[PDB]
């Protein structure tokens, strides 16, 4: 059962298309969140995708024909496409867009000055006390659309609807906190059917606009998950996570989109708790916890090495560079392909018939282990000494592949990596080295 999606950050359409066929599909990833496909300002920086010029499908990722080719190929492979949608604003200043269109002083090919809120700057103190300014003023000089306008709503709804006709199945509503939920509610009335919709609301608490306001219009991103997972793996105790979710003050599980990191917070760096690809084995573990724990709708992040430059765009070379995969090195990192992360995804897919956390065990510090009923069990050792405890599981006796390190063979007599034994009483005598882990499930059992 598909349970996890991935953000192929700055991946062009031909690369996403190929990735769907030879990797995402076969592996069971449910969907791919793509970078904004609409016309945007020119420049090589990543953030240019967040400054729209028009709704024409001509971007850094490719043109309309290439976008449609990608949605056709991914769908045939069983993978949905979620489009990153800009509902709050258009580009700042004046310039040229990727399709040739010029704009300037709140004048675009599809909007005129009257379609925007009157200019004002959002200052850092407004987030805390002034909701009106967080929603009606300009986020870093970006022309704030008058999202209450029937015309603005029909123009955005028409873009969303053209995309669904092409075959797109979900949408990420960028910067939702800056759009009144009532406006998002009218817009949704104009959207045909019921596509997956997740809204980006950054709410760490004490904000004048809360994420709970967006629960009725779709899924919401729970940034507290990302923020708290990092503080816990970096400075806290994993034992604390026994009841991660609602008890930590997070929104309902069925309404949340969770991640260890996203394209924005992985850039900030230095003092900040977020765990990213730069943390190596720490990143594996955080991901294994996320993918094993039954909370939220998780998205795996796929980044590129930005080399300290937080404005830089992606590598010059494509991912699939003529039968030569450009992953894991100094260009694309390809985390969705990392042994522990992919294995975590395989775990989540095979334990979807039991969303409970059973037989939770910890050492009060950084060694944990828990099960998903009789569907699977896992353990993490984030300490410098071998984990040898005996834990209780609800699993059938026999030998299983630790899916974080290998898989079951065609004949089903062996695994390509470490094997874990479940005793007749249902226990496991753990033998997990320092900073390592295991995950086993019912469909990766020997002979
Ligand atoms: Ca706004
Ligand atoms: Cl996000």
Swiss-Prot record:
Keyword Calcium in record: yes
Q: What is the effect of changing residue 299 to Q?
A: Abolishes chloride binding and reduces catalytic rate
Positions marked as site (Transition state stabilizer): 264
Q: What is the superkingdom listed in this entry's lineage?
A: Bacteria
Activity regulation reads: Requires chloride ions for optimal activity.
| Cysteine disulfide partners in this protein | 20-74, 120-137, 327-334, 401-415
Binding positions (substrate): 47-51, 89, 172, 177-178, 207, 264
Q: Binding positions for chloride?
A: 172, 262, 299
User: Per the entry, which co-factors are needed?
Assistant: Ca(2+); chloride
Give compartment(s): Secreted
Q: Does the keyword Membrane apply?
A: no
Recount the entry's temperature dependence annotation. Answer: Thermolabile.
Task: Identify one Gene Ontology CC term for this UniProt entry.
Answer: extracellular region
Q: What is its EC number?
A: 3.2.1.1
Q: Which UniProt keywords apply?
A: Calcium, Carbohydrate metabolism, Chloride, Disulfide bond, Glycosidase, Hydrolase, Metal-binding, Secreted, Signal
Q: Which reaction does it catalyse?
A: Endohydrolysis of (1->4)-alpha-D-glucosidic linkages in polysaccharides containing three or more (1->4)-alpha-linked D-glucose units
Question: Which GO molecular function annotations are given, in alphabetical order?
Answer: alpha-amylase activity; metal ion binding
List of catalytic residues: 174, 200
What are the recorded Gene Ontology BP terms? carbohydrate metabolic process
Sequence positions that bind Ca(2+):
88, 135, 144, 178
How the cofactor is bound: the record states: Binds 1 Ca(2+) ion per subunit. Binds 1 Cl(-) ion per subunit.
Quaternary structure, per UniProt, is: Monomer.
Which family does the entry's similarity section mention? Belongs to the glycosyl hydrolase 13 family.
Please report the name of this protein according to its UniProt entry. Alpha-amylase
Organism for this UniProt entry: Pseudoalteromonas haloplanktis
Q: Which gene encodes it?
A: amy
Q: Which residues of the full protein are shown?
A: 25 to 472 of 669
């Amino acid at each position: 059962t598909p349970t996890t999606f991935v953000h192929l950050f700055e991946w062009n359409w031909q690369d996403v298309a190929q990735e769907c066929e030879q990797y995402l599909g076969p592996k069971g990833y449910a969907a791919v969140q793509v970078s904004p496909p609409n016309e945007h300002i020119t420049g090589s920086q990543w953030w240019t995708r967040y400054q729209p010029v028009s709704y024409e499908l001509q971007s850094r990722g490719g043109n309309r024909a290439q976008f449609i080719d990608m949605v056709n190929r991914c769908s045939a492979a069983g993978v949905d496409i979620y489009v990153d949608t800009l509902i709050n604003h258009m580009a700042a200043g004046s310039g040229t867009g990727t399709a040739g269109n010029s704009f300037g002083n709140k004048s675009f090919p599809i909007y005129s000055p009257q379609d925007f809120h009157e200019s004002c700057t959002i200052n850092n103190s407004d987030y805390g006390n002034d909701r009106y300014r967080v929603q009606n003023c300009e986020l870093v000089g970006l022309a704030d659309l008058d999202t209450a306008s029937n015309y603005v709503q029909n123009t955005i709804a028409a873009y969303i609807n053209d995309l669904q006709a092409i075959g797109v199945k979900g949408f990420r509503f960028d910067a939702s906190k800056h759009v009144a939920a009532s406006d998002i509610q009218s817009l949704m009335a104009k959207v045909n059917g019921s596509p997956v919709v997740f809204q980006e609301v950054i709410d760490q608490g004490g904000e004048a606009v809360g994420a709970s306001e967006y629960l009725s219009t779709g899924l919401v991103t729970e940034f507290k998950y990302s923020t708290e997972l990092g503080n816990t793996f970096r400075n806290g105790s994993l034992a604390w996570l026994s009841n991660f979710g609602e008890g930590w003050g997070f929104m309902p599980s069925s309404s949340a989109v969770v991640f260890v990191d996203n394209h924005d917070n992985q850039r900030g760096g230095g003092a900040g708790n977020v765990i990213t690809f730069e943390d190596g084995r720490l990143y594996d573990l955080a991901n294994v916890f996320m993918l094993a724990y039954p909370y939220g709708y998780p998205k795996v992040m796929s980044s590129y090495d930005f080399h300290g430059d937080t404005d830089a765009g992606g590598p010059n070379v494509p991912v699939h560079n003529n039968g030569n995969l450009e992953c894991f090195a100094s260009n694309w990192k390809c985390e969705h392909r990392w042994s522990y992360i992919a294995g975590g995804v395989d775990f989540r897919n095979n334990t979807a018939d039991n969303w409970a956390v059973t037989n939770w065990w910890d050492n009060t510090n950084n060694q944990i282990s828990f099960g998903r009923g009789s569907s699977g069990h896992m353990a993490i050792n984030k300490e410098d000494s071998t984990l040898t405890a005996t834990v209780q599981t609800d699993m059938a006796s026999g030998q299983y592949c630790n899916v974080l390190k290998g898989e079951l063979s065609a004949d089903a007599k062996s695994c390509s990596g470490e094997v874990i034994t479940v005793n007749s009483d249902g226990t496991i005598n753990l033998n997990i080295g320092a900073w390592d882990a295991m995950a086993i499930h019912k469909n990766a059992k020997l002979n």
